Amino acid sequence: KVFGRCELAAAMKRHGLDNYRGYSLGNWVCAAKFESNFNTQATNRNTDGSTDYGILQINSRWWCNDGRTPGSRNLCNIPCSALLSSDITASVNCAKKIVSDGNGMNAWVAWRNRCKGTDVQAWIRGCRL
């Protein structure tokens, strides 16, 4: 599944991400756009043998277990494969733990580089949520 912008905004609002840890909904939609292009199935391999999974590109070194990553911690207590569902529940629950862990949304490099600093409210504009 690839989400549309307003469809994803709607789903993330349903899951309680609007203002989660102080981050307005547009932050989360922008993060998904530049992390995964709204693609629930996307994966990306890294040089440290970890992999980024799903719509928020959650990484296997710290957050989920994929049975193939060195120095893994599985802080979200979830198999990485669960983050490749077309249903965003597991990714949101993991994201809430990541953003609460103490560095906010800076955890997402694409967000830090291509969303932070811009007017993120524009990502939910016209969605009439």
Ligand X SMILES: NC(=[NH2+])NCCC[C@H](N)C(=O)O
Binding residues for substrate, as ranges, are 101
Residues annotated as catalytic (active site), given as ranges: 35, 52
Binds 85: which of Cl ion, ligand X, none (CB < 5-8 Å by kind): none
Q: Which is nearer to ligand X, 48 or 119 (CB)?
A: 119
Q: Among 103, 119, 121, 129, indicate the residue that binds ligand X (CB under 6 A).
A: 119
Binds 37: which of Cl ion, ligand X, none (CB < 5-8 Å by kind): Cl ion
Exposure b/e, 1-28, CB count within 10 A at least 16 = b: eebebbebbbbbbebebbebeebbbbbb
In the chain, DSSP finds a helix count (H) and a strand count (E) of 4, 3
Q: Which residue is closest to Cl ion by CB?
A: 26
Joined tokens for residue 51: 């992999």
Restricting to residues 30-89, which ones interact with ligand X according to CB under 6 A? Answer: none
H or E segment to which residue 6 belongs: helix 5-14
As a whole number of angstroms, the distance between CA 84 and CA 91 comes to 8
Joined tokens for residue 22: 């102080």
Tell me the Ramachandran region of residue 3: left when phi exceeds 0, alpha when psi lies from -120 to 50, beta otherwise.
beta
Binds 4: which of Cl ion, ligand X, none (CB < 5-8 Å by kind): ligand X
**Residue numbers of the site for ligand X (CB under 6 A)?**
4-6, 114, 117-119
Chain residues in the site for Cl ion (CB under 5 A): 11, 24-26, 37, 39, 66-67, 69, 72, 79-81, 87-88, 90, 93, 109-110, 113, 121, 129
